[PDB]
Design a binder for this molecule. Structure first.
Ligand SMILES: NCCCC[C@H](N)C(=O)OP(=O)(O)OC[C@H]1O[C@@H](n2cnc3c(N)ncnc32)[C@H](O)[C@@H]1O
Ligand SMILES: NCCCC[C@H](N)C(=O)OP(=O)(O)OC[C@H]1O[C@@H](n2cnc3c(N)ncnc32)[C@H](O)[C@@H]1O
Lengths: 529, 529
């Protein structure tokens, strides 16, 4: 002393192994191959809740789950809380009702909190009103060799929560309801597109030229081909090539990879849905977005207004998903709050200096390089996005920020594009697709200028794609939504790790490890005293 | 001369750009923003095929597609083959029926083969019996700037086919039927699991320890965390952790990455479906596989026997998907054809030497290292897999090949596992999952031995996973199927590139480039002469 930091836990593990070893020598198999579960406990509850007090069904069913509680009134009567599908069912181990008495005492002695057990017997409702099962037989299906945390645990410490999801799902079962919700969202999306003739496709994740958006790629290497490859930033280009190929409507709900910073709204690998629809424009896509999200909100309320939160309490607000969404222009709203209305060449030097000095006038300065696009981005970010709470379509961005968006049909130096903002966050991005190969090539020129300027987040010229769209590319509307963030919205959480099963965590130190473990037995030891 | 290799093509491109430029100066927009398509040509055909010869409907509809043919009987009568959704509709441009005569002559002169056009007019059926549309108005939606290949093209040369999928989909539209089929397969799978309470989840693609199967990973690096990461070999471990967490039934249809050789059955990035089902064994999973695939075959015939091919012709055979599938044992069939029946310690040296000499006796030798598992793999591969044509369950492999499969409940030195073989190919792999943490750890030991032996395709010990399963892991059945290969089977193709939209191709040389282009104008020039 005072070393040996994770003493009690090691001791407990060793002793548990010893226990299951003794149990195995006694003629009991701790890990049975097959146990037939005749009914799940939600089905159990749904079927036998009609039972009155002291009533016992003649039916014999078999359930199985994780023991979260083990209490006994005597040696002949034990009560177990068996959890399955995030639902609780009581097991009333009554010795007089158990067929094998020896097995009864051995099993009831051996059962440890955390053990996966199975039981076979009669459904009932006790005098206490607790729906239960009285087992004729029972067995341990998988012994727990460590100490399960109490419910709840780690609710504050996000680290230990998201480092050991397999424990968090057990001690914080409510969290499951998030992920379920997520899978609904996805499914909904699929349906909405599948019913419109869209073809769900799969485009390569490994590339040679990262394009489709503005970011920095993960770099890998293929051995046999002896060549560097890049994990995709966006599936945009390939999907467009599919549209050129003759498949009018395509979509992909896939994993995108971006080597950037990690926060409450950014995971290095995330999930988006991108679709492309021939002979459509961003108006049709606006309507489709309103319809999809509005329906998605109505199938959980079912009004198109959703109740929401707001430190960490329950204060209420409302998100208005009623069609139509509010529509504002990127340059017009920026002009309105500025007082001055921008010089006319937005690409020129004059306007660059002007943005540079309305920047200091509002304390919104950009990290190098300070190109027009980046300065405008920090401007729009620190000034108007902070007030975009209700579902809002931010439309008609300039071209120097939109290389893959088609020219606006009425407004000079603007593009046919919108970004959907909800709760100060970008959820969706959509274009009227640029199908002019000449302008596309010159736009890739115009990106090369930027990545010469120091920017390494600009889009490189893809020659194959250029060839494809040079072979005639239909007028098309394009759409991209962040599944993770929409999930965040609908699940009412302000941390993206709440809707990602295994988020990317910084590998904990030896100090953080030592610490954490030391805490674990600090409290174990305190419980022992 | 004789240089300037891609002369005519360059000239054609330049001239086409000049053409659309002149067209734009004449007051016509080559790339209109929005054209409203009132009806698709399959819907068109479905609705107006009832028309008799010389009959004209009073309805006015608007269609749009790609011009694949342009012929004319006179200057007042032109015939276009407009393709949409891999379907042909004739456009009869009759000048007397066109509203804007000037627009008629300008448009009919400007239209080039490959152009995306839109038309608005009356449906009809001509004297020739050809279902058509007589346009009142029309316009070019997107001009084609290169020469589209004739139908068909490249049917032999797989290279140019799979290098430019956007062209192949146009000139070989039948190929589309493959990918459609694929998306059905996937969907089917989803349904089959969704109806059984399975939760469709997403596990990380970026790892720190590659596990779940036996292969070699792609290596990448995260900047902010300053750490090497690995693209997943299999989602097995994480899904298992989800099962430990309390989610009894999970599945993921995702992208797996393996840095290996490329052939007719191997793409560096492929798609698999993995599910895990608590309180099940590999028997139940056998039945589920029979049911799923049998149903999948019955929903395209609808008998459970499928007609198949077999040099490159149409010779017929039959795949028997009727339940039950034929079941053979890994060691018993290997014994039957051997004559001798293996020594009893399969891990020992004696049996190693024995396999080493029944190997030369059948000319089946292994590349270094020649471990027991690899020798047995080359043995089983070159000897019995060559005769597994009909759907066959190859069951009960030894443990030295199955580190994540549970011990067999009756047979020593064997595991509860099967591999589904169809047409000499592994399509599915399934276990009764190992839930014994001690044996799991010792098995990871037993893999470390191999990767010390020279093998770098063995599985490394995952401590987090070990912790998870040490926290009690329910008896579980696991399943993994190759979507790409199943697609190959159902689409009747012997090349995996036929069911992957953008397969990984070796970046063509300067010589291969020069060649290909030179061929293109060799034939263009021959056509000009
Ligand atoms: N032709 C129109 C195409 C529009 C899609 C475009 N290729 C595109 O990728 O556009 P992005 O904007 O790059 O991504 C759009 C949405 O992705 C979400 N998102 C982006 N980065 C994310 C991250 N690190 N973590 C989680 N989610 C993230 C956002 O909700 C965004 O609305
Ligand atoms: N507990 C049971 C888990 C079984 C799945 C196991 N983790 C696993 O991955 O097992 P594998 O065998 O690694 O992959 C199984 C199927 O994947 C297909 N496949 C594997 N490699 C492929 C490739 N390079 N290209 C295309 N398809 C490929 C096969 O059809 C195989 O049946």
């Amino acid at each position: 002393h005072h070393h040996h930091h994770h003493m009690l836990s090691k001791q407990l593990f060793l002793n548990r192994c010893k226990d299951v070893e003794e149990y195995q020598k006694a003629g009991h198999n701790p890990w049975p191959h097959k146990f037939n579960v005749s009914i799940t406990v939600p089905e159990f509850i749904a079927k036998y809740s009609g039972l009155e007090k002291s009533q016992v069904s003649d039916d014999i069913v078999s359930v199985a789950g994780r023991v979260l509680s083990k209490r006994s009134s005597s040696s002949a009567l034990m009560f177990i809380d068996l959890h399955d599908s995030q639902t609780k069912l009581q097991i009333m181990l009554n010795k007089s009702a158990y067929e094998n008495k020896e097995d009864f005492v051995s099993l009831t002695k051996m059962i440890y909190r955390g053990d996966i057990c199975g039981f076979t017997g009669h459904p009932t409702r006790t005098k206490t009103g607790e729906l239960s099962l009285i087992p004729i037989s029972g067995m341990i299906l998988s012994p727990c060799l460590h100490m399960l945390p109490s419910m709840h645990y780690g609710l504050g410490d996000q680290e230990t929560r998201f480092r050991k999801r397999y424990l968090d799902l057990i001690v914080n079962p409510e969290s499951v309801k998030n992920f379920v919700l997520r899978t609904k969202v996805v499914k909904a999306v699929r349906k909405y597109l599948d019913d419109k003739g869209f073809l769900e496709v799969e485009t390569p994740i490994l590339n040679t030229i990262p394009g489709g958006a503005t970011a920095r790629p993960f770099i890998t290497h293929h051995n046999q081909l002896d060549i560097q490859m890049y994990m995709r930033i966006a599936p945009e280009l390939y999907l467009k090539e599919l549209v050129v190929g003759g498949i009018n409507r395509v979509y992909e709900i896939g994993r995108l990879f971006r080597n950037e910073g990690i926060d409450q709204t950014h995971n290095p690998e995330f999930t988006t849905c991108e679709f492309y629809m021939a002979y459509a424009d961003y108006n049709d896509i606006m309507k489709m977005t309103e319809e999809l999200l509005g329906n998605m909100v109505k199938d959980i309320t079912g009004g198109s207004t959703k109740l929401e939160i707001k430190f960490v309490t329950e204060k209420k607000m409302v998100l208005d998903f009623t069609a139509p969404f509010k529509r504002i222009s990127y340059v017009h709203a920026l002009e309105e709050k500025f007082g001055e209305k921008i010089p006319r060449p937005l690409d020129g030097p004059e306007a660059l200096t002007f943005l540079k000095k309305q920047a200091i006038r509002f304390n919104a300065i950009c990290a190098e390089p300070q190109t027009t696009a980046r300065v405008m981005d920090k401007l729009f970010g620190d000034l108007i996005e902070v007030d975009l709470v209700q579902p809002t379509f931010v439309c008609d961005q300039p071209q120097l920020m939109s290389p893959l968006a088609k020219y606006h049909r009425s407004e000079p130096e603007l593009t046919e594009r919108f970004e959907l903002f909800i709760l100060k966050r970008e959820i969706a991005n959509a274009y009227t697709e640029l199908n002019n190969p000449i302008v596309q090539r010159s736009n890739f020129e115009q990106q090369a200028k930027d990545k010469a300027a120091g920017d390494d987040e600009a889009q490189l010229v893809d020659e194959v794609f250029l060839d494809a769209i040079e072979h005639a590319f239909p007028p098309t509307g394009g759409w991209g939504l962040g599944i993770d963030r929409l999930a965040m919205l609908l699940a009412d959480v302000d941390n993206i790790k709440e809707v990602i099963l295994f988020p990317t965590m910084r590998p904990e130190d030896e100090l953080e490890k030592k610490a954490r473990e030391a805490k674990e037995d600090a409290m174990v030891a305190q419980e022992l005293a």
